[PDB]
Amino acid sequence: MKYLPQQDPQVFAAIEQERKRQHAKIELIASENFVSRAVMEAQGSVLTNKYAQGYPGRRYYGGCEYVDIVEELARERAKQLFGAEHANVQPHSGAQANMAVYFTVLEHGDTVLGMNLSHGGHLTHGSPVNFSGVQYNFVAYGVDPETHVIDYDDVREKARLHRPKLIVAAASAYPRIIDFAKFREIADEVGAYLMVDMAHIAGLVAAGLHPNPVPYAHFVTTTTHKTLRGPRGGMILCQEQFAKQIDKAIFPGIQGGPLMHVIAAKAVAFGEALQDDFKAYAKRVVDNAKRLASALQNEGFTLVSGGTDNHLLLVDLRPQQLTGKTAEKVLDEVGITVNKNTIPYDPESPFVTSGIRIGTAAVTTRGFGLEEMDEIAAIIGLVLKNVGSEQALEEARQRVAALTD
Amino acid sequence: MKYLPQQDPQVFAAIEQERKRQHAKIELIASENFVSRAVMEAQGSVLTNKYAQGYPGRRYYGGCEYVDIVEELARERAKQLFGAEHANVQPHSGAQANMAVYFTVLEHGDTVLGMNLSHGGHLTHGSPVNFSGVQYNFVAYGVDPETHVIDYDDVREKARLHRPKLIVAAASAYPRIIDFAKFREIADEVGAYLMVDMAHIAGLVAAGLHPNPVPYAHFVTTTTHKTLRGPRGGMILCQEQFAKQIDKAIFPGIQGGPLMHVIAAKAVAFGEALQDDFKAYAKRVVDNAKRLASALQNEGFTLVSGGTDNHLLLVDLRPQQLTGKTAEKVLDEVGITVNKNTIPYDPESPFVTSGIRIGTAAVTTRGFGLEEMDEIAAIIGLVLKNVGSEQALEEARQRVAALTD
Ligand SMILES: *Cc1c(COP(=O)(O)O)cnc(C)c1O
Ligand SMILES: *Cc1c(COP(=O)(O)O)cnc(C)c1O
C-alpha cells in the first residue's frame, strides 16, 4: 500500500494488525480462506467508479463496454467451471443470491423445506430472525440421530406432508456428501423446485471432489468466497429457462448497481479455479480434512457422522464434558481459531453448543499438509484435555507458533 | 497492479480499458464519482479474508479485534460527519440500506408514501418491478407541474388519505433542496415514520451545503458512493431508539457477513469527508452545477425547476424536439456521458424520456471549474442543436478531448 498509510494512519494500522493476525493464527473456521494477490488487486481497481445496473449489452447507462467484458468473463468462466446453462454474478453475497432465488419462485407465506438449522442448515434457510423465516413458511428435515447423515426418508415425508413450493438442500455444517439426485427425486414427487446452496462446497464441486448439483437443481446458489477461494460475494447458477426471471430478481428486483470491481475479482478467482493447480489444492483440502479427522479420533475425540467427506468436520465434545463455547475460548488463547457449532440433537442452546466446527481450506491455502494436520490434532488434544493447565496452554502456544513459523 | 497482469491478462486488459475510458470521457452521470487511491487500497486489502458477522465486540466468530477497530472508525466518523446517534455501515448497497429500514418498520403489504418515480423517486421507492413495490403498498406524491418543486400539500393530502406507516423522502433526479422539516411535520400529523434516502446528496449534506435530514428523520439511508465520494456500498443512520432493531434488520435480518474491506474504505472516505478540502470540493460541485445550469440556459435549454440547488440538473428537451434517448446517444458519440431521464409529467415512456440528467460531482473531482462548465454547456449546445451534422460532432469530439487534455 502506498497512499493509505499517509492518508489514514488509523485505518492503515488496523489493517496491518489484521494482516499480521491472519499470518500468526491457525485459521480453522470452515468458511474462511485466503484470496490471491490478483483477486485483491482486482477489488482495489477503478471499477468501483462505474455504475453498471442492468446486464452486459443491456445496461441502463453508457460507458459500460469494458465492464461488460469483465462481467462476461466471470459468467462464461463460471459456466465452464460448473457446467451451468446460466450464471448471474451480481449477488452482493450468498444471502442476496438466496434472497433472489426466493424472490423468483415464492410468494410471501409460501412453504419451503430446508435442512434443520441445528443439524447443519444455514441462517438463510428459514431462521425465524432472518428474512427467510419471516417472509416464508419454513419446515425442516433432519439427520439420523446416530449416523448424522441426512435422513432422506424424512426429507420425503416432510415434503409429502407439507407440500413445499421449494426444497432447499445444502449446509454450513454438514461433513458428508449430499445426494442431490435424491433431493431432485423428492422435489419431482411433490412438484417442488429444488434449490441447492453449495456455498461451503463450491470449490470442491469445481474440482470434481463433490458431486455437482447443477444437473439436479433448478437453482444453485453459492458464495464466491469459502472453498472456491474467491472475493467476498454471491452467485446464482440456473437452467436457461429461469435465466431471465433470475436476472430480473437480482436487478431491478432486489439489488441496485452491481460491484463491478468485485465481479472482476470473481472472474479472476474463476480463472484460478479452472487451472490444474486449483484442483490439486482442492484435493489437498479434502485429504487434509480426512487426515485431521482421523488424527482427532486418535486423540480420543468423537466426530459428528464419524468423520468427513469434504473440507469440514464437527467435534462432538460431550465425551470431554465441554461446551463448544469453552473449547472455542481456550483454543483462541493458544492461537487456533475455531467456532462453537451446534451438533445434531444438541442438548445445549446455539449460543453455548456441544461442538466445534473445523475446516481445512484456509490452512491448506497456506501450504499445510498431512504432517501439519497430525500436529494440529495433537495440539487440540493437548489443549482440550488440559483446560486448567497454563503449562499445557503455553506449550500449545509455542507449537502453534512453530506451525505458522 | 503487479500480480493481476500476469495471472489474468484478459481481466487486466479490460480493467485497463476502463481506467483509460474514465480519463478520456466527460462523466456527467449524476450518480458517478472517482474515489481516492487510499479508498481503493483499502478495498484491495486482506480484510476480504475475514468473516465478521455480528457487530464490533459482539461478533459470531473470534479474531475480529482489528476489523472491530475498522468498523468503529467507520461508525464514529459517520456519526461526526452527520450528527447521527447511530450508524450501521454494513449495508452492501443503497438498495440493502433501504431494504433493511423497510424490514425494520413494515409488515408485508403496509402502505408507504414516496416520491413519484417519474418526478425523481428512486427504484427502491416502490417500483412495481422492485421488491419495495412488490412487498409493500406504495403510494406517490408529486411535484408541481410548473415549478417542478415537491408539492408539500400533495404530500400531506396523500399521507392523510392513504395513512402510510412510512413516508420516504429523497430522490435520484430532484434538482432542488428538500424540506425535511415539512416532511417530518406531515409524518407527525398522520403518525408515520419518516425515512430520508439522501444517497444523491449525502456529500453535500456532509459539507453543510444541503440541510441535514438527521434531526428530522427516524431513519436516514444513503449510498457511501455518489456525492460522498466513497466506495460502492450502503449506510443507515438512525436515532438511538431504533439502533438495535436496525442492527438486527441488517444482520441476521437481511445480510450475512459484511464486506470488511469495503467497510475499511468507507472509514477512509468518511475521514476524507471530515477534512476541510472535501468541504471546498463540495462547494465547487454545487458552484459548478449552478454555473453549468446557467450556461445551458444561455444555450437556449429549458431546465426542470428552472435550475438547481444541488449537484444535478435535468434538461427538458421538448423545445428542441428531442428525446432523452436521442440526446444520450449523440452525446455518447462525442465522449460526453449522460443518461436519459424522465422529466416530471413526461409525455414519453421511461425508456425514451424527454430529458437528460446531468451532475457535476465527477468532473469537479477531476478538477473542472467554472470555465469548464461554460465549455461543456457550449459543447452540449453545439451537439444537440446540430444532431445531423458530422462536422459539428467532430468539432465537439475535439473540444471534449481538449478538456480531458
Ligand atoms: C456462508 C453461507 C451463506 C452466506 O453468504 P454471505 O456472503 O455471508 O451472505 C449462505 N449460505 C451458506 C450455505 C453459507 O455457507
Ligand atoms: C443510487 C441510489 C440508490 C441505490 O444504491 P445501490 O448502491 O445502487 O443499490 C438508492 N436510493 C437512491 C436515492 C439512490 O440514488
**Cell digits of residue B357:** 440528467
Contact B259/A232, CB-based, under 8 Å? yes
Instruction: Tell the residue number behind the cell numbers 406432508, with chain if given.
Output: A161
Residues in chain B after which the chain is broken, C→N over 2.5 Å: none
CB A231 within 8 A of CB A91: no
Collect all residues with Cβ–Cβ distance below 8 Å to A131 and sequence separation of at least 6: A99, A124, B103, B253, B254
**Cell digits of residue A205:** 464441486
CB A83 within 8 A of CB A215: yes
CB A234 within 8 A of CB A221: yes
Closest CA to B91 of B229, B232, B228, B191: B232
Residues in chain B: 405
CB B85 within 8 A of CB B238: yes
List the beta bridge partners of residue A356: A315, A340
Q: What torsion, rounded to 10 degrees, do the Cα atoms B242, B247, B253, B256 define?
A: 170
CB B167 within 8 A of CB B218: no
Integer Cα distance of A314 and A355 in angstroms? 6
Distances (CA, A) of B371 to B70, B104, B308: 40, 47, 18
Integer Cα distance of B39 and A293 in angstroms? 42
CB B13 within 8 A of CB A70: no
CATH code for the domain defined by B33-283: 3.40.640.10
Integer Cα distance of B403 and B257 in angstroms? 43
Instruction: Tell the residue number behind the cell numbers 479427522, with chain if given.
Output: A293
Closest CA to B380 of B319, B297, B310: B297
Integer Cα distance of A181 and A179 in angstroms? 6
CB A305 within 8 A of CB A147: yes
Question: How remote is the C-alpha of A33 from its chain's centroid?
Answer: 10
3-state SS of chain B is CCCHHHHCHHHHHHHHHHHHHHHHCEECCCCCCCCCHHHHHHHCCHHHHCCCCEECCEECCCCCHHHHHHHHHHHHHHHHHHCCCEEECCCCCHHHHHHHHHHHHCCCCCEEEEECCCCCCCCCCCCCCCHHHHHCEEEEECECCCCCCECHHHHHHHHHHHCCCEEEECCCCCCCCCCHHHHHHHHHHHCCEEEEECCCCHHHHHCCCCCCCCCCCCEEEEECCHHHCCCCCEEEEECHHHHHHHHHHHHHHHCCCCCHHHHHHHHHHHHHHCCHHHHHHHHHHHHHHHHHHHHHHHCCCEEHHHCCCCCEEEEECHHHCCCHHHHHHHHHHHCEECEECCCCCCCCCCCCCCEEEEECHHHHHCCCCHHHHHHHHHHHHHHHCCCCCHHHHHHHHHHHHHHCC
Contact B70/A34, CB-based, under 8 Å? no
**Cell digits of residue A71:** 462481467
Closest CA to B339 of A358, A95, A391, A60: A60
Integer Cα distance of A139 and B242 in angstroms? 31
Tell me which of B172, B232, B236, B312 to substitute to probe ligand 2's pocket, judged by most ligand atoms within 8 Å of the beta carbon: B172
Integer Cα distance of A336 and A399 in angstroms? 11
Closest CA to B126 of B44, B55, B45, B197: B197
Q: Which residue of A has its CA nearest to B92?
A: A92
Contacts of range A326-333, beta carbons closer than 8 Å, 24 or more positions apart: A326/A387, A327/A356, A327/A384, A328/A356, A328/B62, A330/A383, A330/A384, A330/A387, A330/A393, A331/A356, A331/A380, A331/A383, A331/A384, A332/B62, A332/B63, A333/A393, A333/A397
Q: Please name the fold of domain A1-32+284-405.
A: Aspartate Aminotransferase, domain 1 (3.90.1150)
Integer Cα distance of A53 and B94 in angstroms? 13
**Cell digits of residue B329:** 446517444
Pairing of the two strands B339-340 and B355-359: antiparallel
Question: How remote is the C-alpha of A29 from its chain's centroid?
Answer: 10
What residue type is assigned to position A313 of the chain? L
Instruction: Tell the residue number behind the cell numbers 408507504, with chain if given.
Output: B112
CB pairs under 8 A between A and B: 261
**Cell digits of residue A190:** 411433490
Q: Which residue of A has its CA nearest to B104?
A: A131
> In this structure, is the dihedral angle defined by the CA atoms of residues B132, B133, B135 and B139, taken in order, positive or negative?
positive
Closest CA to B216 of B231, B196, B199, B243: B196
Pairing of the two strands B26-27 and B336-337: parallel
**B25, B40, B70: residue with CB nearest A63:** B25
CB A69 within 8 A of CB A208: no
Pairing of the two strands B302-303 and B336-337: unpaired
CB A374 within 8 A of CB A365: no
**b/e B246-274 (16+ beta carbons within 10 angstroms → b):** bbbbbbbbbbbbbbbbbbbbbbbbbbbbe
**Nearest atom within ligand 1 for CA of residue A234:** 7
The CB density around residue B20, as the number of other CB atoms within 10 Å, is 12
Closest CA to B88 of B58, B55, B64: B55
Integer Cα distance of A314 and A318 in angstroms? 12
Among left, alpha and beta (phi > 0; psi -120 to 50; other), residue A280 is alpha
Going from the Cα of B94 to the center of ligand 2, the distance in angstroms, rounded, reads 4
Technique of determination: X-ray
Integer Cα distance of B327 and B396 in angstroms? 14
Q: Cα-flanking dihedrals φ and ψ of residue A114, to 5°?
A: -135, 175
Instruction: Tell the residue number behind the cell numbers 479455479, with chain if given.
Output: A273
For ligand 1, atom 10, the nearest C-alpha belongs to: A94
Distances (CA, A) of B48 to A39, B45, B160, B365: 10, 7, 47, 28
Closest CA to A232 of B97, B48, B159, B388: B48
In the structure, which protein residues have their CB atom closer than 6 angstroms to any atom of ligand 1? Answer: A 31, 93-95, 122, 124, 170, 172, 197, 199-200, 223, 234; B 255-257
**Distance to chain A for B254, nearest Cα, Å:** 6
**b/e B290-328 (16+ beta carbons within 10 angstroms → b):** bbbbbbbbeeebbbbbeebbbbbbbbbbeebebbbbbbb
List the beta bridge partners of residue A54: A59
Contact B15/A65, CB-based, under 8 Å? no
Evaluate the omega torsion of the peptide bond into residue B258 and state whether it is cis, within 30 degrees of 0: no
Closest CA to B348 of B384, B380, B303, B316: B316
Collect all residues with Cβ–Cβ distance below 8 Å to A349 and sequence separation of at least 6: none
Instruction: Tell the residue number behind the cell numbers 406507516, with chain if given.
Output: B165
**B70, B103, B332: residue with CB nearest A62:** B332
**Cell digits of residue B123:** 427504484
3-state SS of chain A is CCCHHHHCHHHHHHHHHHHHHHHHCEECCCCCCCCCHHHHHHHCCHHHHCCCCEECCEECCCCCHHHHHHHHHHHHHHHHHHCCCEEECCCCCHHHHHHHHHHHHCCCCCEEEEECCCCCCCCCCCCCCCHHHHHCEEEEECECCCCCCECHHHHHHHHHHHCCCEEEECCCCCCCCCCHHHHHHHHHHHCCEEEEECCCCHHHHHCCCCCCCCCCCCEEEEECCHHHCCCCCEEEEECHHHHHHHHHHHHHHHCCCCCHHHHHHHHHHHHHHCCHHHHHHHHHHHHHHHHHHHHHHHCCCEEHHHCCCCCEEEEECHHHCCCHHHHHHHHHHHCEECEECCCCCCCCCCCCCCEEEEECHHHHHCCCCHHHHHHHHHHHHHHHCCCCCHHHHHHHHHHHHHHCC
Residues in chain A: 405
Integer Cα distance of B296 and B327 in angstroms? 14
Question: How remote is the C-alpha of A292 from its chain's centroid?
Answer: 19
Calculate helix-pair angle for B390-403, B324-334, nearest 10 degrees.
60
Integer Cα distance of B65 and A22 in angstroms? 12
**Cell digits of residue B127:** 417500483
Determine the Cα angle at A101 with ends A257 and B231, to 5°: 25
**Distance to chain A for B97, nearest Cα, Å:** 10
Give chain B's radius of gyration (CA, Å).
22
Instruction: Tell the residue number behind the cell numbers 444438541, with chain if given.
Output: A346
Collect all residues with Cβ–Cβ distance below 8 Å to B373 and sequence separation of at least 6: B288, B291, B292, B295, B360
Q: In the Cβ-directed half-sphere of B327, how many Cα atoms lie within 13 Å? A: 31
Integer Cα distance of B305 and B147 in angstroms? 5
For chain B, how far is it from start to end, CA to CA, in angstroms?
24
Closest CA to A195 of A259, A246, A151: A246
Kindly list the domain boundaries of chain B, sorted by start residue. Answer: 1-32+284-405, 33-283
For ligand 1, atom 14, the nearest C-alpha belongs to: A199
CB-based burial label for A245 (10 Å; 0-12, 13-18, 19+): middle
**Cell digits of residue B140:** 406517490
Q: Cα-flanking dihedrals φ and ψ of residue B27, to 5°?
A: -85, 110
Among left, alpha and beta (phi > 0; psi -120 to 50; other), residue A120 is left
Integer Cα distance of B302 and B234 in angstroms? 34
For chain A, how far is it from start to end, CA to CA, in angstroms?
24
Integer Cα distance of B162 and B167 in angstroms? 11
**Nearest atom within ligand 2 for CA of residue B92:** 7
Integer Cα distance of A206 and B333 in angstroms? 43
Integer Cα distance of A44 and B37 in angstroms? 9
Instruction: Tell the residue number behind the cell numbers 485505518, with chain if given.
Output: A11
CB B264 within 8 A of CB B45: yes
Integer Cα distance of A295 and A368 in angstroms? 15
Contact list in B for residue A272 (CB cut-off 8 A) is 7
In the structure, which protein residues have their CB atom closer than 6 angstroms to any atom of ligand 2? Answer: A 255-257; B 31, 93-95, 122, 124, 170, 172, 197, 199-200, 223, 234
Question: Between residues 302 and 331 of chain A, which touch chain B (CB distance below 8 Å)?
Answer: 328
The CB density around residue A327, as the number of other CB atoms within 10 Å, is 25
CB B381 within 8 A of CB B373: no
Give chain A's radius of gyration (CA, Å).
22
